[PDB]
Design an enzyme around this catalytic site. Sequence first.
Site, PDB file in Angstrom:
ATOM      1  N   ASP A 106       3.844  18.180  52.540  1.00 38.67           N
ATOM      2  CA  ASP A 106       3.471  19.304  53.403  1.00 38.67           C
ATOM      3  C   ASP A 106       4.596  19.447  54.419  1.00 38.67           C
ATOM      4  O   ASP A 106       4.805  18.491  55.188  1.00 38.67           O
ATOM      5  CB  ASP A 106       2.131  19.006  54.058  1.00 38.67           C
ATOM      6  CG  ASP A 106       1.707  19.981  55.132  1.00 38.67           C
ATOM      7  OD1 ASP A 106       2.500  20.515  55.923  1.00 38.67           O
ATOM      8  OD2 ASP A 106       0.482  20.231  55.231  1.00 38.67           O
TER       9      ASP A 106
ATOM     10  N   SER B  31       3.448  15.812  62.343  1.00 36.43           N
ATOM     11  CA  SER B  31       2.947  16.618  63.450  1.00 36.43           C
ATOM     12  C   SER B  31       2.928  15.774  64.725  1.00 36.43           C
ATOM     13  O   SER B  31       3.165  16.331  65.793  1.00 36.43           O
ATOM     14  CB  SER B  31       1.553  17.175  63.185  1.00 36.43           C
ATOM     15  OG  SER B  31       1.470  17.847  61.944  1.00 36.43           O
TER      16      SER B  31
ATOM     17  N   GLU C  74       4.053  14.157  55.036  1.00 38.58           N
ATOM     18  CA  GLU C  74       4.582  15.364  55.687  1.00 38.58           C
ATOM     19  C   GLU C  74       6.096  15.324  55.753  1.00 38.58           C
ATOM     20  O   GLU C  74       6.703  14.233  55.764  1.00 38.58           O
ATOM     21  CB  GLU C  74       4.075  15.558  57.116  1.00 38.58           C
ATOM     22  CG  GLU C  74       2.574  15.774  57.217  1.00 38.58           C
ATOM     23  CD  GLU C  74       2.142  15.781  58.679  1.00 38.58           C
ATOM     24  OE1 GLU C  74       2.624  16.676  59.400  1.00 38.58           O
ATOM     25  OE2 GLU C  74       1.352  14.914  59.091  1.00 38.58           O
TER      26      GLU C  74
ATOM     27  N   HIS D 128      -1.223  14.666  58.981  1.00 35.33           N
ATOM     28  CA  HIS D 128      -2.054  15.499  59.872  1.00 35.33           C
ATOM     29  C   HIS D 128      -3.346  15.928  59.198  1.00 35.33           C
ATOM     30  O   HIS D 128      -3.511  15.772  57.987  1.00 35.33           O
ATOM     31  CB  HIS D 128      -1.255  16.686  60.405  1.00 35.33           C
ATOM     32  CG  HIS D 128      -0.820  17.693  59.395  1.00 35.33           C
ATOM     33  ND1 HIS D 128      -0.292  18.917  59.782  1.00 35.33           N
ATOM     34  CD2 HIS D 128      -0.824  17.696  58.045  1.00 35.33           C
ATOM     35  CE1 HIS D 128       0.009  19.616  58.706  1.00 35.33           C
ATOM     36  NE2 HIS D 128      -0.310  18.897  57.638  1.00 35.33           N
TER      37      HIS D 128
ATOM     38  N   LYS E 180       3.811  28.290  62.158  1.00 34.04           N
ATOM     39  CA  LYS E 180       4.663  27.591  63.113  1.00 34.04           C
ATOM     40  C   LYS E 180       6.027  28.278  63.165  1.00 34.04           C
ATOM     41  O   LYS E 180       6.131  29.362  63.772  1.00 34.04           O
ATOM     42  CB  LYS E 180       4.763  26.111  62.713  1.00 34.04           C
ATOM     43  CG  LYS E 180       3.411  25.442  62.897  1.00 34.04           C
ATOM     44  CD  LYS E 180       3.202  24.088  62.281  1.00 34.04           C
ATOM     45  CE  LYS E 180       1.742  23.660  62.489  1.00 34.04           C
ATOM     46  NZ  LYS E 180       0.830  24.217  61.465  1.00 34.04           N
TER      47      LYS E 180
ATOM     48  N   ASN F 220       3.660  26.173  68.779  1.00 31.29           N
ATOM     49  CA  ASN F 220       4.310  25.784  67.527  1.00 31.29           C
ATOM     50  C   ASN F 220       5.308  26.843  67.052  1.00 31.29           C
ATOM     51  O   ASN F 220       5.781  26.811  65.911  1.00 31.29           O
ATOM     52  CB  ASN F 220       3.268  25.520  66.421  1.00 31.29           C
ATOM     53  CG  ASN F 220       2.333  24.386  66.806  1.00 31.29           C
ATOM     54  OD1 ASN F 220       2.715  23.443  67.509  1.00 31.29           O
ATOM     55  ND2 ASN F 220       1.092  24.509  66.344  1.00 31.29           N
TER      56      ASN F 220
ATOM     57  N   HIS G 165       5.957  21.510  59.547  1.00 30.54           N
ATOM     58  CA  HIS G 165       6.702  21.491  60.821  1.00 30.54           C
ATOM     59  C   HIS G 165       8.210  21.597  60.627  1.00 30.54           C
ATOM     60  O   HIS G 165       8.965  21.753  61.601  1.00 30.54           O
ATOM     61  CB  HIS G 165       6.361  20.237  61.623  1.00 30.54           C
ATOM     62  CG  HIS G 165       4.949  20.211  62.145  1.00 30.54           C
ATOM     63  ND1 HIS G 165       4.491  21.113  63.088  1.00 30.54           N
ATOM     64  CD2 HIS G 165       3.899  19.416  61.862  1.00 30.54           C
ATOM     65  CE1 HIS G 165       3.229  20.859  63.356  1.00 30.54           C
ATOM     66  NE2 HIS G 165       2.823  19.833  62.626  1.00 30.54           N
TER      67      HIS G 165
END
Length: 383
Positions: free
Chosen positions: A203, A178, A174, A132, A235, A46, A206
């Site tokens: 969130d 993910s 998100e 996720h 990440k 990641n 990523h």
Amino acid sequence: SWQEKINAALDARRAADALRRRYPVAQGAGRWLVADDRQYLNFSSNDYLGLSHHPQIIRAWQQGAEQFGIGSGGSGHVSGYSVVHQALEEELAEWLGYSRALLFISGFAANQAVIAAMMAKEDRIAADRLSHASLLEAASLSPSQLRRFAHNDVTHLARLLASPCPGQQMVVTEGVFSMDGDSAPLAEIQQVTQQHNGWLMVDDAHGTGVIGEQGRGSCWLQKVKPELLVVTFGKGFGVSGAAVLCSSTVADYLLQFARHLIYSTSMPPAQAQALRASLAVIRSDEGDARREKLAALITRFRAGVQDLPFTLADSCSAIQPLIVGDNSRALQLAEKLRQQGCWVTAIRPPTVPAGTARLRLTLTAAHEMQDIDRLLEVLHGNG
């Protein structure tokens, strides 16, 4: 009995739902994976900007220990609030456009602490079905009502929010999923939750550091400011930890009521210094270059897959699923890539929809063009 409960759950597992043993590595972050004593190109980490090994973040981690020791000695509400934590909070808030930032030890911890402090049994969480575990598990272990909506389906979400609620509603999603590496339609979502008097929680684990001006989030990119933003640093930032971005009153509520924030041990000051150094690199011209490099590598990969018997998902992320189809073909493909020096892992039902068995690939700014070419060539010769 307990032991019968445990034995019975372990025994019942079908072959496709069992998790494989953990594989110990000497190096697991960035361009190269080292397992045993063998070097592999790493297409599973990641570390999207290659910052886990950046000399400036390594130095910061190292000097911070010289300056502050290691452990903080305690919680933020006693003697564990360092001048370094305050400076990182301030810097994250200034970077992302929020009045306040509060630091946490992980994304799991941030998500759970916000949801535990803000939701009561009367309230409702409306969560994207493919959220996720960090987020979903938090929303599950809450006494509030959890309702999922179809992936990125804003019509479904509106339906949800329109349903009578005895309390307040929090929408959670998100910024980059993910799973498939695809983006949420934040602006549309922000609109229907406002329309139903809800608050929005995103969130951006990523996307943070990796996309948008100065690497700001998925939210910046889409000109949206959710009421709550969660960023995590394991990440793209190449370290560990998380922060909640929020308003003056929400931060005051969390600091008075969130037990998870009040009584947990704060992160080592040296860890916070490494995060401040990471943030600096992320904001710098070098930050732009690493993001531009990552985008070139994704372009090179997606273009090469056009000529292959595979399909791609809708992603502009470092996360680039390769859809293979057949379960046996996908597992044999990952095994073969590993045999040829490319570390990839395969995912199959029921983690993914039927007939959508795939490789879980990730690219990072630490990779080089010839690495993508080596991946494509192995995929051709085995595809």
